[PDB]
């Protein structure tokens, strides 16, 4: 139903037929980024739960797939599996933990 991701449809009457209105979703403006499959921290591998790892060149952010909003890499939106020696292309960065500043204060 239409070109792009679909949202709704509205029918309309017509002589000897039917006329549809497929409201659809189309992304418009694009931006280059540098990605990596996983993040290495303390010998273990972190993966995005529902998102993707991107970087502007200096910092690393996790972002949802079809819209650009940057978020800090935390343990809440990542899950751990395996070591850093089996994935290919993994980069080195820290992983934030929200429990550490709560335990500090």
């Amino acid at each position: 139903c239409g070109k792009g991701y679909h949202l709704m449809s509205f029918p309309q009457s017509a002589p000897h037929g039917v006329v549809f209105l497929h409201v659809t979703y189309v992304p418009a403006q694009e931006k280059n980024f540098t990605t990596a499959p996983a993040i290495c921290h303390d010998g273990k591998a972190h993966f995005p739960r529902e998102g993707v790892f991107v970087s502007n060149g200096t910092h690393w952010f996790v972002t949802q797939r079809n819209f650009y909003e940057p978020q800090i890499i935390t343990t809440d939106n990542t899950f751990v599996s395996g070591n850093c020696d089996v994935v290919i292309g993994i980069v080195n960065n820290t992983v934030y933990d929200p429990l550490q500043p709560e335990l500090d204060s």
């Binding site: 792009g4 991701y5 694009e30 499959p37 993966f47 599996s81 089996v86």
Partner: protein
């Protein structure tokens, strides 16, 4: 000296018109579809094409079918070997059997 049926059916007015789309531009369409479905995932079928590395696209497809993407990245070479063997097997299947 040995008349075939093409000339016999041509001399009684039964002509065959040529198609508009010849095999060169059909092959060009298939090449464009393959290039899009390798280097863009499924985004080009909705809006414009976006570059995505192939391993991450396979991770997205596995996350679609119900297996989380850590299974892929620890078993990528097995996936590549099985895919190459499957393509070779289907090439041999088209080479041998004519049915």
């Amino acid at each position: 000296a040995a008349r075939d049926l093409i000339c016999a059916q041509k001399f009684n007015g039964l002509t065959v018109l040529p198609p508009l789309l010849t095999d060169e531009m059909i092959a060009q369409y298939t090449s464009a579809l393959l290039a899009g479905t390798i280097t863009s995932g499924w985004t080009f079928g909705a809006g414009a094409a976006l570059q995505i590395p192939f391993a991450m696209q396979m991770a997205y497809r596995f996350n679609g079918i119900g297996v989380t993407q850590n299974v892929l990245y620890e078993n990528q070479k097995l996936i590549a070997n099985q895919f190459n063997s499957a393509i070779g097997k289907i090439q041999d299947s088209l080479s041998s059997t004519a049915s």
